[PDB]
Enzyme design. Structure first.
Site, short mmCIF file in Angstrom:
data_model
loop_
_atom_site.label_atom_id
_atom_site.label_comp_id
_atom_site.label_asym_id
_atom_site.label_seq_id
_atom_site.Cartn_x
_atom_site.Cartn_y
_atom_site.Cartn_z
N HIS A 263 -34.62 39.99 -0.69
CA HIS A 263 -36.06 40.02 -0.89
C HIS A 263 -36.54 41.29 -1.59
O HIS A 263 -37.68 41.32 -2.05
CB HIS A 263 -36.83 39.75 0.41
CG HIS A 263 -36.90 40.88 1.40
ND1 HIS A 263 -36.07 40.92 2.51
CD2 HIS A 263 -37.80 41.89 1.49
CE1 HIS A 263 -36.46 41.97 3.21
NE2 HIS A 263 -37.50 42.58 2.64
N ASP B 92 -29.52 38.26 3.77
CA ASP B 92 -30.48 39.01 2.99
C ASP B 92 -29.91 40.26 2.33
O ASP B 92 -30.20 41.38 2.76
CB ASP B 92 -31.70 39.34 3.85
CG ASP B 92 -32.99 39.61 3.08
OD1 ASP B 92 -32.91 39.82 1.87
OD2 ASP B 92 -34.06 39.62 3.70
N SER C 35 -36.69 47.78 4.83
CA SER C 35 -35.95 46.67 4.24
C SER C 35 -34.87 47.21 3.30
O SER C 35 -35.18 48.02 2.44
CB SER C 35 -36.88 45.80 3.40
OG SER C 35 -37.66 44.95 4.23
#
Ligand SMILES: O=C(c1ccc(Cl)cc1)N1CCSCC1
Ligand SMILES: O=C(c1ccc(Cl)cc1)N1CCSCC1
Ligand SMILES: [Cl-]
Ligand SMILES: [Cl-]
Ligand SMILES: [Cl-]
Lengths: 695, 697
Positions: free
Chosen positions: B64, B206, B632
């Site tokens: 992402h 991810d 992240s």
């Protein structure tokens, strides 16, 4: 893994003892003496109950006593929402049409029935499974006037193992069973429909009744002179609670299982029964939900119909999950292939022939069974105007004497029942347009109910126009349309009524399909008698339990949780803390009783909380249960009452075909939570005082 | 509470970290005067974290995080977003425009310097102590004359910490030639998609792979075909030893924002205004959108992304309000401030109690204004698409009122109209959303506080919201394409001056800006009082178990690999497996589709050295590390500093953790590095990437 006959207790005792059972075999089930079995009852023909006092007090589920609580509820005293607690025996409420059945004696009558059956004359006779035939044999064995010589008693013979074993039951039936206590619906049905088939569960699913009898403890219908029954056996209540891995056992009346399905029957159950019910109910529920969410008055009118459809919808989703993920089809295929190989080895081809006859019958009835489930799910239960009034032959042969007004009053009564306070014609038209669009795309023109042929013929395929026309021109389309008919009734108007013709056509097709499909049951049944005989002759009657058939069975296991999915564990026990976490005051299902919320805040748990101070609510166990086990007593290794079975998790609904050790659990209300509600919520100390509570 | 610690705080935390399982030497993890593991951590594309995993500049971050770069290189012929991308040679790696990676070369405490410069005070109420402009002038003064030219690739920055009680100068090295190297298909990289956002258990792979390029000397350089991969001063070793329950874990990254020093009054405001308004307004908006998307498959295509974008902060607000209600966040802030007030009274210093009082009084005074601001922002500015319809500029209005500039203005207005009424815009769906959003808004906001045009609902339309909205579209120039073209053919200023959609959009933006301007002055007294408040807290309980609020600077956090109980009788373990991916597979639900190559790896058990001791294939794990947005892509380290995973999310039960850390609920959601290497190996077949990493047994 099983729902065992009482006769099989001897054969199972050693394994049960190795699993933790401490009580003597004959104290649990004695074929010629009093045993714990004598404290178990069939409650109101479809639930299980248990005697918990020397004065006939009975515990069962709240959903088992629901109709009796509702029938005694009024706007002034709403026992359904507030609960009910009779503070004296004379205050307990009688119930009309209630019964409790004790299983007084059970006998193996296999040789007797098999000898009587030898007087055959037809090898394909279904008398071996006929309730009428078996009742004639039961009466012959009991004697000419048995029920007169032994009042309150009755006999019954049932087939087991597909007609390979027969048992006679001597039953004692009591019909004066009075409502004693019930928690509010907020406790008795806490999850309501959102938590149905769900573990973890936080529902206090119990209700209390009392068996009444004449002065001699003999069955008697309701009379003001009836005295509470002093039973020959009642359960002691345990307050020691449960721990993970504790031995648990249940006695009850499981209704049906399909443990001897062939692999072809598993495929049929998936691809026809479950997929059609899933697809059709999803369409129906989808339209209903859209309408209920847009109009709060539609939500009031359709909430119960929506909830009633979701119940078997959820069961079918759970069952299809097992077929897809737990290898149900494969294990049936391995079961039949093993019997076929052993049959070939012994030089007996009848087992392979029997499995082949079942497969060929399943394959032959496929299109008919598909058409039946399609019309039943799609129209018979899917569309409300399918159950609209159809004039009887007596009513048309009255409209064309002054009894014309008596016919109109009968038709009007039926019309008012169809178009009741909960019926919306607009919602029904929307549901019918979606249900019929699916139905018309699945059933060809030559297989359609006669009136549905008009969709292509007269309405150019416009389903909306066809449904609009049924309501616009029908005498049951609106109240004003009915009244205009009632003022000037002619048989020619009813003979051409679009709603009458639709309802007639769909019921004609539904009945024709049923009649055409019924003959296919018999070859399967006869081949199952041979199939199960081979399975029993090969692997024995111990591991292979007889299919459930609403007879008394026992099951044993342990208090154990399970992992529903990767990295998730559900423990074996829920607590009062879980009720409080779920509280939602603006969601009727998850409202918490104020007196119960206060008990939790003050920690007023008395002798009912666990050793850590947490108040238990429910637990789950590896016992094998199904519908019919609803209010079953759950016992300790010592035979003391530790809970009440009330549900099973959706992951185990495929367990009626194949038991799932790692997923299937019985959902049980902890007896400590039952007593906490009687004590701190109901304030009914007299009920606690008459029970035998062990430390 | 658990902490997002400054690198400077490693010394005073080291002994506790060692007692918790840390085995590496302190200066191997962070050394102000030498190379350390800190040198392998990067700020990836200004809002994510990354890590260097090879001597040739290979970088790992989240899928992402690299999503826009994968999308920009995807076409109908080569869809890298859907199928994945695996450059089989360095020359095949794709350059990205507007990308950056920032290394934190040096960090320095400049508190005494900044505090001395601030003493030259001209107004004690000055906000210069938090001003990026002022602090940059100080950073430039300290660094030297023409530092950017004297040291190409480097830059200096000073940031305030602890509400202006601590200042750090960062020397950053920025690389702008960062090339896409590898990415799993979207089915792995975003497996849960929006259904599993903020969810544990989690089964999403991810990750994405990039490479830093530089000139011949390893110095920052923009994209050039002559650029060579960066030979970094430090990179992470990859561990294949996996994780076990209770194992020590640590993260380095750039957490964006926290509110650890909120008063109890600020917690009440966040709940009763911010979260309750966002919850209520988004529930109305999403409810109408969902009904329309479910009824029309073309509306589902057009509104899916807008619906998903609204649900993200809606879910966060639900999770945050759950913590306020169940974890005693308000109470613990009240106990924090009462303890400081009691200690201040004993010390004879009333300034801490005065500071908490100033914050409470400011919160109480701005309540109605803040309520009106969130109501219009959630209800109209975000809630109604025609609020962002075209508003003719002062120069566009003049251009329409005797020159060729009339056609120039119409082309500019048309361009904006075409952006508003795009392929995903439904006027019918917007009218339905506006009718419900405005009904709620008109119920909360009184007539005297309404944007001027909304007064017409009561005045001209007899309270009929539907009629008011119908009239906006019926008579507006932007109501349909034909209505715009009729205007474009004969444009008059007088038509735009009376246009109901123009007047609505103008009115709501006027009120939105007036409220913002009236509310902005209330921030400063709170900020100044927080400087005094946090100074007292630090003087009382020390800069030891009170971490400075996150501010997009490099921090470390430590904890253990541990699951948790979300509710009664439910336990979520610390580790998910490949079976969990398979249990979730749904071929007719785009979110839960499983990559065929991955499904085959699972069926054949082709797990190589990446499976755990029991032969199960690990996917993700969770840890008691304290992370937030900005973390992240963060590297997750072993007790030995080896890479064991990449942080990619956090569970909804821990979103209240930006105010109060929740030890029994809050977890960082991490993709296991063994699953990353399994996807590179068995799904991408990119052996060269495995070969350049230093993989330890
Ligand atoms: O959540 C489910 C469910 C289960 C299995 C599958 Cl494959 C899909 C959904 N429910 C609600 C509880 S009752 C059974 C159906
Ligand atoms: O199911 C919920 C939720 C959580 C808390 C409460 Cl009080 C109500 C609902 N989610 C999951 C997705 S992230 C947050 C929202
Ligand atoms: Cl009895
Ligand atoms: Cl002071
Ligand atoms: Cl916590």
């Amino acid at each position: 893994e099983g729902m065992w006959l009482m006769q099989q207790l001897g054969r199972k005792y050693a394994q049960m003892k190795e699993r933790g059972l401490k009580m003597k075999e004959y104290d649990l089930y004695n074929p010629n003496g009093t045993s714990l079995k004598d404290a178990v009852v069939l409650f109101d023909g479809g639930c299980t109950g248990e005697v918990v006092s020397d004065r006939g007090l009975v515990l069962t589920n709240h959903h088992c006593g629901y109709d009796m609580i509702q029938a005694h509820s009024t706007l002034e005293h709403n026992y359904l929402e507030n609960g009910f607690w009779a503070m004296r025996e004379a205050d307990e409420l009688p119930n009309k049409d209630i019964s409790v059945v004790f299983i007084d004696k059970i006998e193996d009558v296999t040789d007797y029935v098999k000898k009587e059956l030898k007087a055959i004359k037809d090898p394909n006779s279904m008398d071996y499974l006929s309730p009428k035939y078996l009742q004639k044999l039961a009466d012959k064995k009991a004697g000419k006037n048995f029920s007169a010589k032994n009042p309150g008693l009755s006999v019954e013979i049932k087939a087991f193992y597909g007609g390979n074993l027969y048992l006679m039951f001597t039953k004692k039936t009591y019909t004066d069973v009075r409502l004693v206590g019930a928690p509010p619906s907020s406790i008795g049905k806490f999850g309501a429909d959102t938590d149905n088939w769900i573990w973890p569960r936080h529902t206090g699913d119990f209700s209390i009744f009392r068996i009444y009898a004449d002065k001699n403890g003999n069955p008697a219908p309701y009379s003001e002179d009836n005295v509470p029954l002093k039973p020959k056996r009642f359960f002691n209540i345990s307050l020691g609670g449960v721990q993970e891995n504790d031995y648990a056992m249940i006695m009850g009346f499981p209704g049906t299982t399909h443990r001897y399905f062939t692999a072809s029957e598993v495929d049929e159950w998936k691809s026809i029964d479950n997929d059609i019910r899933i697809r059709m109910r999803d369409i129906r529920q989808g339209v209903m939900l859209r309408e209920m969410l847009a109009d709060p008055q539609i939500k009031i009118m359709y909430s119960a119909k929506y909830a009633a459809s979701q119940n078997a919808y959820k069961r079918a989703i759970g069952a299809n999950w097992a077929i897809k993920t737990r290898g149900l089809r494969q294990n049936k295929q391995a079961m039949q292939d093993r019997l076929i190989a052993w049959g070939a080895k012994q030089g007996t081809p009848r087992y392979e022939e029997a499995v082949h006859e079942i497969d060929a019958t399943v394959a032959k009835r496929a299109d008919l069974r598909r058409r039946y489930w399609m019309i039943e799910e799609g129209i018979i239960r899917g569309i409300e105007f399918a159950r609209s009034p159809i004039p009887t032959e007596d009513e048309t042969k009255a409209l064309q004497a002054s009894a014309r007004k008596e016919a109109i009053d009968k038709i009007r009564t039926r019309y008012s029942k169809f178009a009741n306070k909960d019926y919306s014609a607009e919602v029904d038209k929307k549901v019918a347009v979606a249900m019929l669009t699916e139905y018309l795309k699945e059933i060809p023109y030559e297989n359609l109910p006669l009136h549905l042929r008009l969709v292509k013929d007269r309405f150019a395929g416009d389903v909306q126009a066809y449904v609009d026309d049924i309501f616009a021109r029908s005498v049951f389309g609106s109240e004003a349309q009915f009244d205009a008919f009632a003022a000037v009734p002619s048989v020619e108007k009813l003979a051409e009524d679009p709603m009458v013709l639709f309802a007639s056509s769909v019921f004609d097709e539904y009945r024709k399909l049923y009649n055409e499909l019924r003959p296919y049951d018999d070859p399967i049944l006869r081949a199952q008698r041979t199939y199960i005989a081979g399975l029993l002759e090969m692997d024995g009657d111990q591991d292979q339990f007889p299919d459930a058939n609403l007879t008394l069975r026992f099951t044993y296991g342990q208090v154990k949780g399970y992992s529903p999915r990767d990295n998730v564990y559900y423990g074996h026990q829920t607590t009062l803390d879980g009720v409080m976490e779920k509280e939602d005051p603006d969601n009727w299902e998850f409202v918490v009783d104020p007196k119960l919320k206060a008990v939790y805040e003050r920690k007023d748990f008395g002798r009912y909380a666990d050793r850590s101070g947490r108040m238990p609510v429910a637990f789950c166990a590896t016992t094998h249960t199904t519908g019919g086990n609803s209010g079953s007593p759950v016992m300790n290794a010592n035979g003391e009452l530790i809970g009440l079975n009330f549900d099973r998790n959706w992951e185990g609904v495929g367990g009626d075909i194949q038991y799932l050790a790692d997923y299937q659990r019985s959902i049980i209300v902890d007896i400590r939570y039952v007593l906490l509600v009687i004590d701190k919520v109901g304030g009914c100390q007299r009920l606690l005082d008459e029970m035998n509570i062990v430390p």
